[PDB]
Amino acid sequence: SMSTETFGFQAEISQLLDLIINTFYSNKEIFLRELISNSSDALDKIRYAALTDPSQLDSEKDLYIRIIPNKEEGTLTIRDTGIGMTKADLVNNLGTIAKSGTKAFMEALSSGADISMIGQFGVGFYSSYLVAEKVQVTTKHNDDEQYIWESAAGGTFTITEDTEGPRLGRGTSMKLFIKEDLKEYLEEKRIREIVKKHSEFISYPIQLVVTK
Numbered sequence: 001s002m003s004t005e006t007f008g009f010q011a012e013i014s015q016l017l018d019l020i021i022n023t024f025y026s027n028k029e030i031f032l033r034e035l036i037s038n039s040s041d042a043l044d045k046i047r048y049a050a051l052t053d054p055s056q057l058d059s060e061k062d063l064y065i066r067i068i069p070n071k072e073e074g075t076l077t078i079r080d081t082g083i084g085m086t087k088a089d090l091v092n093n094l095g096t097i098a099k100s101g102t103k104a105f106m107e108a109l110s111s112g113a114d115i116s117m118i119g120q121f122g123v124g125f126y127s128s129y130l131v132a133e134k135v136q137v138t139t140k141h142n143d144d145e146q147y148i149w150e151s152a153a154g155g156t157f158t159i160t161e162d163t164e165g166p167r168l169g170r171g172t173s174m175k176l177f178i179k180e181d182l183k184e185y186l187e188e189k190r191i192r193e194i195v196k197k198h199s200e201f202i203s204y205p206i207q208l209v210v211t212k
């Protein structure tokens with residue numbers, strides 16, 4: 001972790017985060033489906049890139065999704081060995097089309113759409129704020145350095161070159177700091193029932209690390 005740069009969110013994204021954070025939803029568990037689907041997409045991208053350049057997998061040959069709850073730290077981590085994100089991807093809303101898609105999503109919500117449809121607008125990453133008060137995204141793309149993106153959805157996010165953290169090799173590790181009253185989402189049984197309900201058949205292994 002080196003020099004930290006602070007960026008403002010685009011107005012529509014701050015407006016959406018306020019809606020995600022301060023509205024009651026009965027189906028907040030859909031955040032996990034969105035992150036797992038995003039990880040599966042990132043894994044498909046590295047595989048596709050490796051079709052024409054096999055050395056793209058040299059940085060990490062094992063393609064998987066791994067979920068690590070940590071009740072002591074109050075965090076849920078979703079790690080994949082997908083294509084990762086460059087710094088430019090991180091700046092450009094974690095590689096999404098959030099510029100236009102958050103506004104479109106909020107217009108759909110005002111007309112009766114459900115929060116679970118957030119992934120149809122390409123901005124499913126922001127669903128992490130349904131259960132997390134802060135998110136730290138560590139990421140490593142073959143073409144760039146390892147970075148840490150962080151935001152507590154207070155109008156800004158930071159990007160820091162990660163020189164002191166464990167090397168990912170390639171991919172993205174999303175660490176969610178779960179809100180005080182939503183700690184059920186660190187429970188092993190809750191996590192497994194959610195993965196089974198919404199993410200039962202995907203193309204990659206989903207690993208859950210349980211500690212004793």
Ligand SMILES: [Cl-]
Nearest residue numbers: 009010011012
């Ligand atoms: Cl703006």
